[PDB]
Every structure is written in C-alpha cells, then in structure tokens.
C-alpha cells in the first residue's frame, strides 16, 4: 500500500464533528499513531524510514 498508494498523513476519524466517529476506540486518528498504539514496532520503523513517503513524527 505504501509503495504506490495513499499518503501517510490521513486522519482516521477526520471530519469536523468529533463526537461522531465509527468506533469508540480513540488512538490518535493517524496511521503512525495507530501503529504506535498497537505495539507494531516493525510497522512504525518502516513508516518512519521509507523512500516513498516519510511520515513526520511531529504531524498533528
């Protein structure tokens, strides 16, 4: 997916009305935050360093 696909700065719940989300699991609304919260060390390691779309760790 990362090789030829979507950008990494894609908010998960997104939208403008925070009280309406698809699931009550709050993780950070980001792929990097989702990987970090679920103890995916290999996934976060790949996301930080990859020569197609680096993920800024300071992304809000």
């Amino acid at each position: 997916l990362v090789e030829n696909g979507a950008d990494v700065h894609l908010r998960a719940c997104g939208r403008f009305f925070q009280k309406h989300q698809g699931t009550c699991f709050y993780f950070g609304e980001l792929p990097l935050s989702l990987a970090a919260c679920t103890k995916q060390w290999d996934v976060v390691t790949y996301l930080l360093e990859n020569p197609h779309q680096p993920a800024s760790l300071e992304a809000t």
Binding site: T23, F25, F27, T38
Partner: protein, 61 residues
C-alpha cells in the same frame, strides 16, 4: 433463573460455539477492532410482548 443456579444460567445466556453449530448460539460477534468487541445478544429474556420473562422471574418470583 428461578432456582438461583447462576453458573449454568450465565453460560446459557452467553453461548457462542463455532463451525457447523452456529445456529445453537445466543451471542454473535459482529466485528472486532482493537479492544472494541461489538457483539449481538439474543433476547428470549425481554419483558416486552413476552409474559413471564426472565427479568420478572428474577425480580419477583
């Protein structure tokens, strides 16, 4: 429910199984996403349009 036996009452209340015995169940897991485990329970124990329900039996009898 009436006799006070809880250990088998709870199991009958939450019966899942797997494989060919799917219809013999009362608790169907819809989807799982992290800690969230949204499921569907069966209602043979609802007072509405059901006289002599489990709720009344626990509460009164």
């Amino acid at each position: 429910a009436k006799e006070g036996k809880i250990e088998i009452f709870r199991h009958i209340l939450q019966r899942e199984f797997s494989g060919p015995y799917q219809p013999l169940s009362r608790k169907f897991t819809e989807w799982c996403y992290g800690p969230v485990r949204v499921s569907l329970y069966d209602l043979s124990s609802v007072d509405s349009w059901e006289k002599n329900s489990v709720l009344e039996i626990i509460a009164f009898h």
